[PDB]
Amino acid sequence: GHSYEKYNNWETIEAWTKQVTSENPDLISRTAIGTTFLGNNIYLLKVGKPGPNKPAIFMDCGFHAREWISHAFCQWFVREAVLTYGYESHMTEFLNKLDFYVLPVLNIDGYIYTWTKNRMWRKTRSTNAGTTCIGTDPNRNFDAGWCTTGASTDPCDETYCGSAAESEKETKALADFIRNNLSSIKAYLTIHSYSQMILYPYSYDYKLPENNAELNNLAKAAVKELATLYGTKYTYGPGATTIYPAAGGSDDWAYDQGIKYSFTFELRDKGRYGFILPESQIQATCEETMLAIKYVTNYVLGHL
């Protein structure tokens, strides 16, 4: 049984994507953009009032298996969009004017594994020749300064960058989809935990975006909206120096594809529970994160 206030396993999440789609056929369609190393379907939800050539925002969760509040949020978001459509002015405008592409869980095989075997697992669950070490890091596997810094060429490492960029069926599937929908996608948002931050490019080098001032202003105003609920303090800035150098990330890659608004979110907390954020903080985390996402969304409306 599914709950938005608890963490769901992949069976429950899969069943939910099918169920939430069938009940909101007017606001949600559902596809699979590919399969994982183990053969699981990577589901994508398109949320919005259908219409001709609508611009889109793309958000994914569950890059990293152990970061459960991530997966929890994509689900919370989807329910917020469909429950509040027509009743809350801003989301009503949002869904009429654009589409949200929500990818609930990218790294499905890893996420299963954190339920079955190792709650602290991070990487995919693909094999590597010549070793029993399992997994590539999805967020070192994109073609953005690939494996030049902040990434390991050791398969046993937590940031193993893979045998080549897009070696993972999962990262290939996501890149392929983005690359084929470049004309419509205006923002890219990728949800991780933890740290309470909003990051923008770059991490594969120490240069800043061409619209550096704009993204800085935007992040600053987003973390302000988020604080308004419970006073939760987020910080923000470029990835390389706000967290660490790390090439091959999807935010840098999407940006260099030409998506001008490209952010990595780190949700709660600051380490007191870390990846094991208790279920009793899901709702409050998700509620405050919504205000940040919606603020960014409204701004992007200015550029359609």
Ligand SMILES: N=C(N)Nc1cccc([C@H](OP(=O)(O)[C@@H](NC(=O)OCc2ccccc2)C2CCCCC2)C(=O)O)c1
């Ligand atoms: N292009 C990017 N690198 N973008 C980016 C920006 C901010 C964070 C991140 C990601 O960080 P993350 O996985 O969410 C996560 N990092 C993490 O688990 O790192 C594990 C690790 C283990 C061994 C070596 C190096 C790193 C949080 C970072 C902030 C402190 C708390 C943990 C990432 O490492 O892919 C990526």
Ligand SMILES: [Zn+2]
């Ligand atoms: Zn992560």
